[PDB]
């Protein structure tokens, strides 16, 4: 099985994604 | 006298040009669908996702690293699908990051004569998301459709 | 009142003198037929809830980018496919 | 005993023919500064926006977006053309604040009535060491 | 030879260097007739070269396994004259200087307004203080002796 | 949520300190421990922007006021937007 | 009303003021406090506006200083003379141009530096000149030092002359202010009489002097048996000779025959295939037509009598809907403000220069210019030095303008108003078009790094890949390169060899001009050029429009147009002064010329400059790699600089080692100015504390209180620094590598 083409773009792109999503939503908020 | 202060107040940080305030440039901006105050966010996104998804394929498909192979046709027009899920997904957080659950629309009530408005839903957490929603959906459907027409139908076309 | 004359400042009357307009606002009825309307509305409903979409979308982004790359064939990329050369020797032996 | 004059919503502007300079949404989500003043003649003057506008004789009001500019404006007008000058601060609720003469005396003059706020009793080398106000809210400056 | 360094009169590196600097100068020179300006200056140089070369042989330097020669500032006897003379002849001058521009600001110090005695120079003052860093290290001394060199505040 | 600007009691009495200031955050007031009968107060440090025009203007031998920069509002950053 | 108004010994001559340093402003007059003091004194030497309120003694001054310009000027020029008369190798390099390298200056024998004494050539050692004034004197028809020492003479005489002018006509004669005042009759005088009459002047050296000398050179004849310029001046027959009108005298002019002028007055083009540059006929008609054109567009403006135009009049009488007022109240602005007219004529000089430089490299006007490539090299780098400082400077007195010099309750102008309305529209603007100029101009060259460091050729921005062809200049050439057969029917040749053809001038086995083609690397090039260009103006014009207020501080103007900042308030209010403006754009310029001169060195290196072989084929310098590995940065740092710059690195031992010193000292001289521009006053104040404790513990601290430069003074300190280092590189870098091969 080929690990790096699965976990390459999760950790280059659908990581990232999350990350900074979360980091956008819990920055802007107003508790 | 071609140059005008906004809206007759020379006191606002702005101006009145024929590129700001001429009556066609006036109409074309109104009926986009992003200034159709009294119509379903949904409809609106709707059609705002079916011109950008539509006009994304074509850089993707022509200038994509496999633009010269068997797979120019598909793989840029599912690029785009992805950059539509990328776009909408941005348009979600701001949903999520200006409007609350609890708040009205903070769009403006009055219009240039001073008359009384009723304010644009869109700038509402519900109708933000109603719009971000049909802006996904529009988006595949565009892409989708731009992919039937060039690829899967082979209507003639120049492609650049 | 503001609408007078040489006067921009009413003190009952904030919006007009903070120039809070809609400068291309339109509040012309829907120009869409109702039953493409209609068929947009309903068929674009699960998208409506924002953190169901945004879950949903990620999962999804996500899963289609780990299928695509796993699964595509291997004259595609040129990464997914090795050297299909002979490899060369380094300028002192390989060391 | 002072007493801050009433701001006059119905005062006439100067002549001006539009600046980018001016308001933003600031003015409409937060505060934006009104001066007021009493030109004795028509004449012309700068406005700190950019720009020259033509104030018109007897009262002018003019609306700017924070108080320096109210100040500034008041200070070229009270050095060049002798003019007395009040600005206010407006919320989009409507409330009106009378900022500048506190007491209707400008603030460069002495005038009784006036308490001491931020006073320190000492010396500025006589200031407490921050190791002495660590792990505690208060400020050396603030004791 | 000291930390293994060959005299520059016995080293055929240093040799070689001469004969390679003649060599260049000569291949200059061929493009001239004898009788012509740059062809004198040429030789000049030459001369010059030569000059130098034997003079760095014979003065006792070391020359390296490179041909050029060594400085040793180890304080060897031998070679006091590579380093400590000139660092002597630098200090004495330099003292002079400092001891000389010391003694102008301190002459001007006690006036109305000094600094017009800075930006405007007084010649005279300057020129009998001159020659007072003749004498600096004696001076220095006594001075460091007294308790007038330093200034305890 | 301002600056702070503090007065000490080595204030000669000048108002340049006044003068120099662009948002009329300080004052004079009455005093009576120098020869001018009066002191500079910073009761509008709220409207501060920490320009500190007024400390370089100050002629005692350290500054009788102080503008320390603290935590910064939309008219502490001079946001006109 | 337009006389001469003088007013007669306004100043006395006397040392007094010698002795008083500072003595024209009152705040240091005074005397020194601190070290600051030294630097203010010569920081306001020059600025006449600070010293007095009065128009007059500021004009006088200002006409006084032009003519002390005027002296060193005359001086310099002098020297050149001098420098080319002795101890230089003019009349060797006349008989054979094409083989020996000009040389002007020696050095002497003193600690080993006569090795910078090359062999230029023709029995001469010495420093090799670029300056190109060999080339100019062949032009002029020069041919013994004996002229170019009474040249000399006569420019010393002149030095002297302007100097005692500029004595006269402030110390004893000075002109009022109404003088000055008097536009209309200045650009009178200096249309009709300064160009139109120099032109007419310079016209006629050419026909009577230039033309037979310049022929008698290229029809091999020794130099020194071609007969004296006088000669053909009093034997009409020995011009005649050559130019059989000459035989008709003037009576052709008199009578409208003015085809009969049609040996010595060409409208030929291109090149001289004997010597590499423009036919000298050319160039005298051409001088003849610009005076005809300057000498009666110099009768335009009004004076004493009343026919004429009044550029008040002219100005006020352009006024648009957009506009309002139009032009109206600027005649009074640019009559009074001696910034404004310095602001515009800087603007207009640099300008000119750039395209003086441009032109002198695509049409060289000196016989044997072409073919040195040094000269065509320093000359194109040097002017565009000088055009994009004096822009820089433009807009740099056009801030102090705005500062001081402007005021709306009187000398109020409505288009200057309607500028500073929308403002802000302009700065967002352009900072769009300087944002997305930078995108598709340098992420191009990102691409193609990263697309050929991927091992994907394709797929890159080159001639064998995607291309970005420039279609406009393309056209542009093909039709310059056509234009003698239908558009200019009178030409016999086009206006330059770069344009295109099968035309190609090659002297002495170097090629002078080739078609220059355009390509995708030339694209980039281009909108890099456009992309540093529309920064620079960015900076400078929002400088210019925020000089006065902002958003952020509105009493500005009340600030200064030269002061560091506004306090850390406000979030910081660090440079927010027009002179700080104009201290940033200056390493703006500076990039933007030295990347426009790396593209004119590699272009001519790869595809213009070589040699010519006896069978005909071509070999350039570098071989043509300019289409092909300028399009990435790898490519400049390895083709161009790491190449080229084996030229300088390995001229120790030789004639060239002063180009390598002094790449090395630019190189420290660059290093150095960064501890200027990164670092700020405090530490260095609080560090000279130390020192000066030090100091003072030995009783030798100074009264003069020692001081750490002041902010703004750090910051000119640091960009000065800066640019004479990164532009010293470059020289050194260019001379070397364009002498050793070239
Ligand atoms: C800055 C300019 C720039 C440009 C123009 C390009 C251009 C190109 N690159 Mg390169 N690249 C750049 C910088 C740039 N690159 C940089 C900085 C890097 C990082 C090192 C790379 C690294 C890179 C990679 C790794 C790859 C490329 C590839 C490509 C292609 C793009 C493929 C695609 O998916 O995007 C298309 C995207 C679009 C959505 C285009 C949007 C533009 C729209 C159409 C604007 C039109 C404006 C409109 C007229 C405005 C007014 C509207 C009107 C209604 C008023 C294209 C040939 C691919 C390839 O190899 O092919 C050659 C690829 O694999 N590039
Ligand atoms: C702590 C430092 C560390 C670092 C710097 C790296 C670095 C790297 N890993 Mg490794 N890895 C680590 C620990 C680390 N790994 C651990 C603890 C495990 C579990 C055994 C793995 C298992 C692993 C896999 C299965 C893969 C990589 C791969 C990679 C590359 C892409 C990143 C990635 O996909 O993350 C993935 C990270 C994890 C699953 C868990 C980390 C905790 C990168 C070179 C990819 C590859 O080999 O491409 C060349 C890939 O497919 N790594
Ligand atoms: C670290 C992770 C990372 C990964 C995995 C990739 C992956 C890839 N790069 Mg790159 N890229 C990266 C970082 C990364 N990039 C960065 C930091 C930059 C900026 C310098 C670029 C700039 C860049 C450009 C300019 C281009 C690429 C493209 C390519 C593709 C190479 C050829 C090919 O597969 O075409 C085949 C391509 C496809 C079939 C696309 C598949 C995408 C799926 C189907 C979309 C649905 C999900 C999508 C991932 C988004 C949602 C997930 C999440 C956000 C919720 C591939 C997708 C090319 C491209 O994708 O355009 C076609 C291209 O033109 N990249
Ligand atoms: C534009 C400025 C200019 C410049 C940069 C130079 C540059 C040079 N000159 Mg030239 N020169 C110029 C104008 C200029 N000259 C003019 C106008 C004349 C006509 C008089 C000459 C005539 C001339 C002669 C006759 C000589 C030079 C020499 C030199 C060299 C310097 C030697 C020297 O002066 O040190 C000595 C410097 C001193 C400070 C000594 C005191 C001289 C006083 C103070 C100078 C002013 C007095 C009048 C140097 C290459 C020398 C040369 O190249 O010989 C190989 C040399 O002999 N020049
Ligand atoms: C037709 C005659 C005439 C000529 C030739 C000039 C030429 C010149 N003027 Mg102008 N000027 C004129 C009429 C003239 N002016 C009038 C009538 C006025 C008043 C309205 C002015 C007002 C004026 C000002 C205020 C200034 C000039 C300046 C200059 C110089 C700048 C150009 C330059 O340096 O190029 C280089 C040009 C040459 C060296 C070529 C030779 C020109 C010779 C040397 C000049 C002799 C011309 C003179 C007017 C006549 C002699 C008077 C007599 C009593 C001896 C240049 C010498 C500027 C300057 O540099 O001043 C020093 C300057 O500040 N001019
Ligand atoms: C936008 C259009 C425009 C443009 C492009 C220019 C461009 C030019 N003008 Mg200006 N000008 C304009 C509008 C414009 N002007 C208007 C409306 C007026 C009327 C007020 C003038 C008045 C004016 C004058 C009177 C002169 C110029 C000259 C020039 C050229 C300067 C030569 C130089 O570079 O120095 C190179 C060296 C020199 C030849 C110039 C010497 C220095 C001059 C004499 C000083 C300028 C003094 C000026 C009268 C200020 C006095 C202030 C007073 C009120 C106290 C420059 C190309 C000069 C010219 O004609 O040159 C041929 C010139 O004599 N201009
Ligand atoms: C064409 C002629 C010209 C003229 C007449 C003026 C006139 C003037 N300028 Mg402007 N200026 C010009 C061109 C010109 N400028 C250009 C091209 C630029 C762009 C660099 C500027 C940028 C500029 C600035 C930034 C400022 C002025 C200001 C001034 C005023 C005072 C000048 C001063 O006091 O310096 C007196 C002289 C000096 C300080 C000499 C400094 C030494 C220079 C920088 C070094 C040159 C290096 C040299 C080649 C290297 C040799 C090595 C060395 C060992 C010898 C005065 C009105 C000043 C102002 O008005 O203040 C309010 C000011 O702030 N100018
Ligand atoms: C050498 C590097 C460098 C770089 C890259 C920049 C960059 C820039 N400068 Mg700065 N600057 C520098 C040195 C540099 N500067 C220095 C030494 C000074 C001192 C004088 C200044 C002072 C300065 C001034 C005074 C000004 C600027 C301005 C600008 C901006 C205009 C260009 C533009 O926007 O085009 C687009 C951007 C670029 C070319 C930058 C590189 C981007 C590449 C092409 C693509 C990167 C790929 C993509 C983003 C993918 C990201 C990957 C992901 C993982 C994040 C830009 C941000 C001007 C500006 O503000 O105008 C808008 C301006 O006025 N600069
Ligand atoms: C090398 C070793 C150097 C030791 C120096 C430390 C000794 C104390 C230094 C004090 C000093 O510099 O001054 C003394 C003088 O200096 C010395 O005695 C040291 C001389 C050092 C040079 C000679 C050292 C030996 C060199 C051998 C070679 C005494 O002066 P005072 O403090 O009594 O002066 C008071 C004044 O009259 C006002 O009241
Ligand atoms: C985009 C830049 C827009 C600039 C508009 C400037 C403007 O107001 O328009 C003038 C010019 O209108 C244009 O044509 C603007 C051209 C825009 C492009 C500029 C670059 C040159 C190509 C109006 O000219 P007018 O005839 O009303 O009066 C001019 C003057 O006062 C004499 O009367
Ligand atoms: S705070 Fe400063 S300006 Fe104010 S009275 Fe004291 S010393 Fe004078
Ligand atoms: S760091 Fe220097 S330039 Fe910046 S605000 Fe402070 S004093 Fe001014």
New interface residues.
Partial sequence: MNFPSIFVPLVGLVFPAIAMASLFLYVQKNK | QVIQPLNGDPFIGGLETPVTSSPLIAWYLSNLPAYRTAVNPLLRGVEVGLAHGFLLVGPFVKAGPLRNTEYAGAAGSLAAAGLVVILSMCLTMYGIASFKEGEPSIAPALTLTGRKKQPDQLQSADGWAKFTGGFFFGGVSGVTWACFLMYVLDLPYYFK | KYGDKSVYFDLEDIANTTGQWDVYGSDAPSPYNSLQSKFFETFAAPFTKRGLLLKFLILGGGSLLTYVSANAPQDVLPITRGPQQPPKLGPRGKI | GFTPPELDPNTPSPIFAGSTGGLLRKAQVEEFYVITWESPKEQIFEMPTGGAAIMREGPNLLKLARKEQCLALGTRLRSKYKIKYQFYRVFPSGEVQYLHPKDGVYPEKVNPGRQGVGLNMRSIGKNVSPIEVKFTGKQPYDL | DIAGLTPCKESKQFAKREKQALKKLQASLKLYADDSAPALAIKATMEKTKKRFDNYGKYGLLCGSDGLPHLIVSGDQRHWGEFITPGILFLYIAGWIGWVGRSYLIAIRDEKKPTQKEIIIDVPLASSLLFRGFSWPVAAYRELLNGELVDNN | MS????????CIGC?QC??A????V?????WDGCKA???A?????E???????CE?ACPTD???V?V??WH?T???????? | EVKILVDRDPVKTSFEAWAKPGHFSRTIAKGPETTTWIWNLHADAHDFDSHTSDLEEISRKIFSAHFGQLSIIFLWLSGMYFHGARFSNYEAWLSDPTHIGPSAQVVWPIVGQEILNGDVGGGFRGIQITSGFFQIWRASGITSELQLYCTAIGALVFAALMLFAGWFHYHKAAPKLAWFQDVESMLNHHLAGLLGLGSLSWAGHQIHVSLPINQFLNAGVDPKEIPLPHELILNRDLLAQLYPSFAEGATPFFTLNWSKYADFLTFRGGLDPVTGGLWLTDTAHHHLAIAILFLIAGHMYRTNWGIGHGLKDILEAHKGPFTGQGHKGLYEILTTSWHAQLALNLAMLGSLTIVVAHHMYAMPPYPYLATDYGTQLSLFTHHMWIGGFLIVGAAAHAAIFMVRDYDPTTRYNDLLDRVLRHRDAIISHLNWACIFLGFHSFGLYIHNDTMSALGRPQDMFSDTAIQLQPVFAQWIQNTHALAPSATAPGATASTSLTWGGSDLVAVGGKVALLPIPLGTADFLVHHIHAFTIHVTVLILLKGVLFARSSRLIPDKANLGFRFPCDGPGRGGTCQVSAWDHVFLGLFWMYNSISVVIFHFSWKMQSDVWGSISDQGVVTHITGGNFAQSSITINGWLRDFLWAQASQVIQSYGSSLSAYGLFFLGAHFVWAFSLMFLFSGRGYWQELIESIVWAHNKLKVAPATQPRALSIVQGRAVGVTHYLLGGIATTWAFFLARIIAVG
Avoid: N
């Fill in positions: 600056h702070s600007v503090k007065i000490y009691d080595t108002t006044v003068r200031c662009p948002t009329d300080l004052e004079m007031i009455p009968k009066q002191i107060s910073a009761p509008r440090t409207d501060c922007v920490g320009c500190k025009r370089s350290f500054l009788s102080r320390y920069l910064e939309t008219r502490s950053m001079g946001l006109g937007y």
